[PDB]
Symmetry: D2
């Protein structure tokens, strides 16, 4: 997985979900008066509404990525082998990992507000049920200011990092991902000037030789480097449909095609869905491996004063337009 | 530009068209009785029908990529800086570069047949008009045998290569593209065995560290290596819709996003359209940069015995499916 | 800038020192009764003897790398932009960065001992003099067990890491260096098996295509990855001269030639000297950019119980063996 | 395996020889009056004198690399899998592969002369002996003008290329080698300007991040790219000893250490010797895997009017200078 915040005019937040098996994800709106029962925090019977992609178990939305009605977004991405959660402690605010997106989006409106309120927080090892152990996650948090943060709980505790590139993948720890970007500092979209062999006429036989060393791999570092590049150079000052179109193309630059990422014998990680959420307008755009047509759900066309989850299909069949 | 032949069950031929400016491309069916006026060859008033993406100029289809009713396909890709065209000569069959796709698809059925009949061919320097200079191209030719060839006219004449990877991009010359592939022979889709530092325990901190050196650049060699990999490892034995779906994903593994490939001062090459044609069935599937929904035109639903070009729009606006409209129909 | 511990039979500790400024380095033996006047620790007038490369100022040895008579070695390498030193504090054993090598070698014998005694230590911000500010360093510590540790003082304090690859360069932080190695797990000295494009014959046009992605840059990560590989695959079970010869070849594979590493206008970082120190025997072998002949100084051929520094020249002119001299002796 | 022409002030021509088998090489001077018995050319009893590294068999020098007294140099490097030799033909000047260095250095003075005279040449399949089959080679030719050419006989015949980088390794064909160079056009010895992520502050955590993608592998393309760079940026305007020292450092940067290039089960290609040959002065400097001290043989301190081969040892034991 790969998550980005894109700021051409309005602000768009979303991610590719790359895995070998689905968890019954659907489009889920949680209205203001759905009652969250948090594990080690007071229950919240009135809170912000949110929309995102979630698994639903026992009438509970287990979000993978979502935005709230105030224009804050959070995406959870796998952090296996890097992350660590800690036992509930009395001196802190204990948030279980499976409810971190819900809690943050229920309660806060801005990245700055999240930074302030995380200083006293412990991401606990509580799991949703005996049947569902707590998978290892880290989070991207973004909002309408165009800035994001990275939230990582590891061996040395909870860390909150300013994210100057507005993107996140999987391992390694976020400071290492940032450092590795300097290794690509000579990459350019066009042609470099020849300071490689001064006095020699090199035949620039292809366009874009400046990107010859841009990573194309399916591993976590390669996708992080390439998406940072695609995001940084994407168009600006676009209106709604053009902004959504370019958002999907940025994430397709690091999509995983079936066969390229082998995680067990004939088991492949592939890009199962892509979500694009307009922070200003509360609209979720999406497509999936089997359907390239973009679909859209608008949060504000629903009764946000309600208390029941409002659910829509995510995975769809290829929707071909037959011309003749 | 990137062109592939994919053979999961039926066979699919198509390409990404990456460039900075459109040339009025549309979907064009040329029926059997449209009369080709070839520059230096006998006119053909009866021939195989074909479907593909083309510009239309003075009621002449100038194809970018197409397939014919017998299951042959040809795509033209830029070969600028590598190619060479030659003056018309009497000792050869002279095919102008702009008409190569039309001539081959009007006349032949199989790759083997094309290979036999190119032995005496000169790709000529004739252009479509005094005011439309001949763009520099090389071609991928594929068919339902799952095999393909590369046709290249350079400084040493016309060359025809067997294509063991069923893909093609731009420069350099095709043997160089194949040699370069061996530089990536250690790539695997999963995790390698650690013969790098024997005795040392290297934590495999990410999935697919075997692809860590797979190229992701927008340049010609980078796209060639990546698409060869994506095409080789794509699923097999799939039915129609699932095959088409996987075909578009193979080509999206090398798509060009606006901003990533700069070819002039703030001028960008991007993937303007993607085509996918079923050789068995004569169906053209397509999308474009602005519309990710796949569209389809079936050549066999038209009157193939006619003599007029049949045209459909290629470039489309984004076709969003609004789910919770609350129209309450 | 590149330091290694090499364990073919005997154990060898040493380093390339690559830089653009020289600091008057010489070979320096510190005998057992030289009086160390540490900045914030009691003086030691009797201690282990040691030999290495050092500057000498005000009759004090300021070591860049050295070993002691017990077979412990320490090398200091630039850590600019990553390291942090801290003010002297009462709760801690305060060691100044410029005296870290001297103190460790004067006091301890084994890596395990160093690891046990660093738990309460603070690397202090004290400088040797007003005209000699404390350059930012981190250290490699190795011994005759063939194991090593990395000692780094950064924004989060002092850390001590076991080093499974027995090598060290400059930035970034050592856990990041280790992690980066997994990115090269598919590298092999020979030819990989083709699991890249199964069913395609890839002509292995060159020997050692398994190292096509091995880094050759002058930067810190590139040298770390390549030296780890050369050190891992170097010959074992070898006599003194053959062991020393292979050691120099390992470090030469990551040497910085003048012109390749530009650090200012027409100013270059280059490999000023290479040291190789036999831990069991107390011999230092060295050459330098201007002299490729290897020189040797044996510690145990001096009076190890004196109290004056014993100094020898490090940098030399090229020492060419003229063969067909026709002296007819 | 790697050959260069280096032109700081005087002109230096030489090579690393990297292999897993030795061929009895020695330093060999061939005086003006040694009689060459060429397979299909008239015998030459009077010719230019030369010095180089050669095997000696049946009183015949089989050169690996050498220079002549006029300042012309030739080096033979493996072309296995790429080269082709052809049967003797009446229409051509037929030169056997093992005698190409000998004939060229005996007959010609300049690179331009060699170009003019290769138009009628055919590299023949004639071998030296039943125990010495004709190994597949291609050649670098350089002279004191600071120019060089590449001579390659392949399936399409004999080709002569102008060499803009004054270096050569093994496969592939030379035009492909030059094309591959353009893939490194963004490499610089210092720090690149950040046009990769404009607007983002990339910490340049190490010196020479401009060389992060320079090849360090043992394969033919990797050594070619790196040595071309090391050669191009090496110092200029230097005196004799300074120049020779820099020449050896250039080739050390692409040396093959034992264990990094495996060609058989526990069998390794490694740099067995390095030769450096001053074109103006006729001096051969050399060292070898086992001895890093540099040795020198001056061609002009011998009687060049003689007719017998003058031989010295090449491979030596490590010559350590014990100080105390
Ligand atoms: C691409 C990558 O990073 C893999 C991420 C997948 C496997 C993650 C992303 C979000 C995850 C959900 C989050 C909600 C619950 C949390 C529970 O602790 C475990 C089940 C759960 C549905 C997670 C499953 C894995 C998940 C989809
Ligand atoms: C991605 C890449 O290689 C760019 C290829 C584009 C620019 C090429 C490919 C097909 C070309 C057509 C072919 C038909 C005619 C031929 C005439 O000689 C020139 C006009 C023409 C429409 C070409 C324009 C460029 C073209 C789309
Ligand atoms: C690439 C790289 O690591 C270069 C390291 C150079 C610049 C370092 C290594 C050891 C250093 C010595 C250590 C002894 C003293 C310490 C004083 O604080 C400063 C002067 C001193 C001679 C250092 C100079 C830099 C140095 C050679
Ligand atoms: C990597 C690389 O280039 C290694 C090249 C080695 C193996 C070549 C280079 C010169 C060769 C000599 C040339 C003289 C004779 C020629 C005969 O035809 C065969 C024997 C001979 C000694 C060659 C052996 C291989 C050789 C050292
Ligand atoms: Ni309606």
């Amino acid at each position: 997985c790969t998550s980005i915040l894109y700021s051409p005019k309005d602000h768009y937040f979303g991610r590719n979900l790359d895995y070998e098996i689905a968890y019954g994800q659907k489009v889920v709106i949680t209205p203001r008066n759905y009652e969250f029962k948090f594990a080690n925090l007071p229950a919240e019977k009135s809170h912000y509404a949110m929309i995102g992609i979630a698994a639903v178990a026992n009438n509970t939305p287990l979000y993978c990525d979502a935005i709230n009605e105030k224009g804050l977004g959070v995406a959870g991405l796998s952090f296996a082998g890097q992350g660590k959660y800690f036992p509930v402690v009395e001196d802190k605010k204990n948030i279980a990992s499976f409810e971190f997106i819900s809690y943050i989006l229920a309660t806060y409106e801005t990245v700055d507000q999240v930074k302030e309120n995380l200083t006293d927080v412990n991401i606990s090892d509580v799991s949703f049920s005996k049947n569902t152990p707590a998978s290892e996650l880290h989070w991207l948090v973004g909002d309408k200011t165009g800035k994001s943060i990275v939230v990582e709980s590891d061996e040395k505790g909870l860390h909150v990092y300013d994210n100057p590139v507005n993107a996140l993948t999987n391992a390694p720890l976020f400071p290492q991902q940032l450092t590795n970007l300097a290794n690509y500092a000579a990459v350019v979209p066009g042609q470099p000037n020849n300071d490689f062999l001064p006095g020699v006429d090199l035949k620039m036989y292809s366009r874009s030789l400046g990107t010859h060393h841009l990573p194309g791999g399916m591993d976590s570092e390669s996708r992080f480097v390439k998406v940072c590049f695609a995001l940084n150079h994407a168009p600006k000052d676009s209106d709604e449909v053009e902004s959504v179109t370019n958002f999907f193309h940025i994430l397709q630059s690091v999509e995983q095609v079936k066969g390229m990422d082998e995680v067990g014998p004939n088991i492949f990680e592939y890009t199962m869905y892509t979500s694009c959420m307009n922070l200003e307008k509360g609209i979720l755009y999406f497509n999936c491996y089997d359907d390239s047509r973009i679909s859209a759900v608008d949060m504000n066309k629903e009764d946000l004063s309600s208390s029941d989850l409002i659910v829509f299909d995510l995975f769809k069949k290829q929707d071909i337009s037959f011309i003749n």
